[PDB]
């Protein structure tokens, strides 16, 4: 079926939970043996969220190459994304090592450091220009260059230096700051505006490594971001845009990381975002 009318048909019939459970039943199951090794317990935020072995990002290190991060490679859309958990106190150096080694331009953050009164990820970037951060375990230096605070999101320019080689690179930090503590946003308008700002920066384009996207677990809000981006790109590429099937795209993405889209409300919000976004594109 088309999307917008499939949408109204699920609303009128109130069957979002049944649609979402079908997706969960059909989703791929692949091994995640490296994630579950005892030496990696303090590298995982949640025991039930792990990268598959076949698609995990490897650190360029011979001691321990593990990080909770996955490469999502979308062949028809010609887009790639790295989806990862919010960094932990003992993985902030690994996080920036990955950004460096994978040649990423942008980092997309969809959570606040504290939500619901608890810490959802480490404070992993500097908050003042004159107070830079040094990660001694991976030999990197990170400096805040500029910050632009808007009503729904903040964009930061960061300088990452590889201290071994003295090479430097500019990284863009796109921080969506207004996702509610409970539920999903009422309108997708600010989320779509944010997606378009990431696109306009070059961070999603083939001349760079894949964008790094995270929330707390790296599967819920993060899944919504890449699912919406890929669906809108396919609607532009194809002769028949009504042929784009958001459930089929989601199942393809779940071949590369488990659990993408965590609730039926997130599934409905993803439909809403793609539907509204397709009208603005034209
Ligand atoms: C103009 S500026 O001060 O050099 N701006 C700047 C500095 C460093 C980086 Cl990585 C990016 C931009």
CA of 92 to the centre of ligand 1 (A): 23
Q: For 1-282, give the CATH class.
A: alpha beta
The alpha carbon of 145 and the centre of ligand 1 are apart by a number of angstroms equal to 6
Atom of ligand 1 nearest to the CA of 159: 10
Distance 23 CA to ligand 1 centre (A): 45
In angstroms, rounded to a whole number, what is the distance separating the alpha carbons of residues 162 and 217? 27
145 annotated among ligand-binding-site residues: no
223 is in an annotated binding site: no
Does the annotation flag 156 for ligand binding?
Answer: no
115-119 long-range Cβ contacts below 8 angstroms, 24+ apart: 115/181, 115/216, 116/181
Active site residue 231: no
Domain ranges of the chain: 1-282
**In sequence order, what are the residues at sequence separation of 6 or more whose Cβ sits closer than 8 angstroms to the Cβ of residue 118?**
none
Pocket of ligand 1 (CB under 6 A): 145, 157, 159, 170
Atom of ligand 1 nearest to the CA of 168: 10
Q: Which residue CA neighbors atom 11 of ligand 1 most closely?
A: 170
Residue located nearest, by CA, to atom 6 of ligand 1: 145
Q: Whose CA is nearest to atom 4 of ligand 1?
A: 145
């Amino acid at each position: 079926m088309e999307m917008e009318k499939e949408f109204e048909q699920i609303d009128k019939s109130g069957s979002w939970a049944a649609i979402y459970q079908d997706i969960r039943h059909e989703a791929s199951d692949f091994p995640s043996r490296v994630a579950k090794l005892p030496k990696n317990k303090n590298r995982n935020r949640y025991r039930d969220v792990s990268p598959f072995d076949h698609s995990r990002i490897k650190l360029h290190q011979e001691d321990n190459d593990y990080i909770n991060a996955s490469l999502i490679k979308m062949e028809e859309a010609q887009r790639s994304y790295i989806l990862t958990q919010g960094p932990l106190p003992n993985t902030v150096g690994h996080f920036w090592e990955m950004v460096w080694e994978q040649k990423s331009r942008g980092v997309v953050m969809l959570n606040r450091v504290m939500e619901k009164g608890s810490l959802k990820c480490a404070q992993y970037w500097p908050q003042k220009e004159e107070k830079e951060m040094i990660f001694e375990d991976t030999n990197l230096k990170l400096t805040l260059i500029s910050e632009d605070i808007k009503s729904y999101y903040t964009v930061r320019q960061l300088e990452l230096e590889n201290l071994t080689t003295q090479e430097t690179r500019e990284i863009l930090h796109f921080h969506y700051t207004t996702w509610p503590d409970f539920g999903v946003p009422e309108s997708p308008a600010s989320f779509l505006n944010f997606l378009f700002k990431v696109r306009e920066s070059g961070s999603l384009s083939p001349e760079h490594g894949p964008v790094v996207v995270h929330c707390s677990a790296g599967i819920g809000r993060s899944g919504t971001f890449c699912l919406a981006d890929t669906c809108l790109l396919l609607m532009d590429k194809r002769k028949d845009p009504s042929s784009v099937d958001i459930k089929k795209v989601l199942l393809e993405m779940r071949k590369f990381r488990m659990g993408l889209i965590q609730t039926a409300d997130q599934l409905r919000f993803s439909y809403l975002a793609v539907i509204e976004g397709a009208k603005f594109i034209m």
